[PDB]
Design a protein around this ligand. Structure first.
Ligand code: NA
Length: 458
């Protein structure tokens, strides 16, 4: 009605844990998007010219501003068949858009599958999927991740590796010409003091965001996902390999589908049959030609593009480590209680790397330093000495700090402690020689406290 304030859209702050979208750095990262996925409950507000409260778009809590609008001219493209046609919509509204579109399509050549696209991103927090939606939508709620599993933080990838596949089929697009003058006819409308935005570009069709958690290794998961999407989604081919089918059988899949008929589907699944049902190309027709899957907005005053700003706070992935004695061999070389008792306890030391206290594996980068203390207690006597417990033995104590990295890039590492063998000496105890202690060598190995990891001692 009178003057209007431009509400600055806040920077969307995303905390991630070792992950970011592939298009970055090519810790903190700032970047921008200009397309927003249109959840299908909002489709009625997403049409060329649609006027929305300027402070209501980033959280997707669209609030329309009722106003009388001048005619608008849009380019209607079917990109799968490189067709472009200009149409003027005299009275911008949802229903003016649909009447123009449906009427054009009844006579036009169309597309069965539209223009295909997919892209893969790694992620660790479900907040990061906000990037794929191009808004501050609560992606945790959309994927069912706003509750805490016992001893695994809420909103997180639970398995080793998380990936999301944003994939969509664009049947047609609507792109406004920049208004030559005023988008609105008269400035009596009530925008509650706030400069509004209007919808200036829309892509139509169907879109999914497929969340994939898996315990396979990130490098192999990215590869398998990409190759199966290429084969199935791009090339309509179901002949997968033995490697692909088994990854599909073991991965957790969570699909958020912006259906091309207006429906919204959240589907969890597993298995090659399900994967082929949900990743196969949808099909369009003239009576179901697609619905808004993403859009872009422009400011009313100056038609300038509304930008959604993202700031990733990339934290270090959580690292839990457990020292474990494997292939334990305990040999009593003799023991007749006629002098001799010789026990040699040997094991292969392994550190296992974990994402959380539920023992989900992780693969720390090869530069993180793991420290293991070898506390050697050594004690000898020519004749056997009686101690009620080993606490009372006057050990010659000595310590080494062993340093190890995940050189071989696995979810565990063997800690070699001696030349030309993988075995560590845990204890050599000789008794009698008679029924007391003649020689005690025990190595107590324990992880050393460090800021780069949390020790699980179990
Ligand atoms: Na939608």
């Amino acid at each position: 009605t009178n003057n209007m304030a431009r509400v600055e859209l806040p920077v969307i702050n995303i905390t991630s844990f070792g992950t970011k979208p592939s298009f970055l750095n090519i810790e903190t990262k700032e970047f921008e998007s200009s397309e927003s996925v249109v959840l299908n409950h909002l489709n009625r507000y997403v049409f060329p010219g649609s006027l929305l409260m300027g402070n209501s778009i980033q959280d997707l809590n669209y609030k329309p501003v009722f106003a009388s609008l001048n005619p608008i001219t849009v380019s209607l493209s079917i990109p799968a068949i490189n067709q472009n046609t200009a149409i003027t919509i005299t009275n911008p509204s949802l229903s003016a858009t649909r009447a123009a579109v449906y009427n054009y399509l009844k006579t036009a050549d169309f597309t069965q599958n539209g223009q295909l696209s997919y892209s893969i991103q790694q992620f660790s927090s479900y907040d990061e999927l906000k990037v794929a939606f191009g808004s501050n939508v609560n992606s945790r709620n959309l994927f069912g991740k706003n509750s805490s599993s016992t001893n695994v933080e809420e909103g997180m990838v639970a398995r080793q590796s998380g990936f999301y596949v944003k994939f969509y089929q664009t049947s047609f697009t609507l792109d406004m010409d920049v208004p030559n003058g005023s988008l609105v006819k008269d400035n009596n409308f009530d925008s509650e003091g706030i400069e509004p935005v209007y919808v200036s570009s829309i892509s139509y069709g169907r879109m999914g965001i497929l969340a994939i958690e898996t315990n396979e290794k990130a490098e192999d998961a990215k590869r398998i996902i990409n190759e199966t999407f290429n084969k199935l989604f791009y090339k309509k081919q179901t002949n997968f390999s033995q490697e692909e089918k088994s990854f599909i059988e073991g991965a957790d899949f969570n699909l958020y589908l912006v259906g091309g008929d207006g429906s919204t589907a959240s589907q969890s699944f597993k298995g090659y049959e399900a994967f082929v049902n949900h990743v196969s190309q949808g099909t369009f027709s003239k009576d179901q030609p697609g619905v808004p899957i993403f859009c872009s907005y422009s400011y009313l005053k100056d038609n300038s593009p509304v930008k959604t700003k993202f700031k990733f706070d990339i934290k270090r992935p959580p690292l839990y480590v457990k020292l474990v004695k494997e292939n334990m061999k305990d040999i009593n070389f003799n023991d007749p209680d006629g002098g001799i008792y010789d026990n040699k306890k040997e094991a292969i030391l392994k550190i296992y790397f974990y994402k959380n206290r539920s023992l989900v594996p992780t693969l720390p980068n090869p530069y993180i330093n793991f420290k293991i203390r070898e506390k050697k207690k050594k004690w000898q006597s020519i004749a056997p000495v009686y101690y009620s417990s080993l606490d009372q033995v006057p050990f010659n104590i000595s310590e080494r700090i062993l340093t190890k990295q995940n050189t071989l890039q696995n979810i565990f590492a063997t800690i070699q402690t001696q030349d030309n063998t993988e075995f560590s000496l845990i204890s050599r105890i000789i008794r009698g020689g008679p029924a007391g202690f003649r020689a005690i060598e025990i190595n107590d190995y324990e992880l050393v406290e460090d800021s780069n990891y949390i020790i699980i001692k179990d």
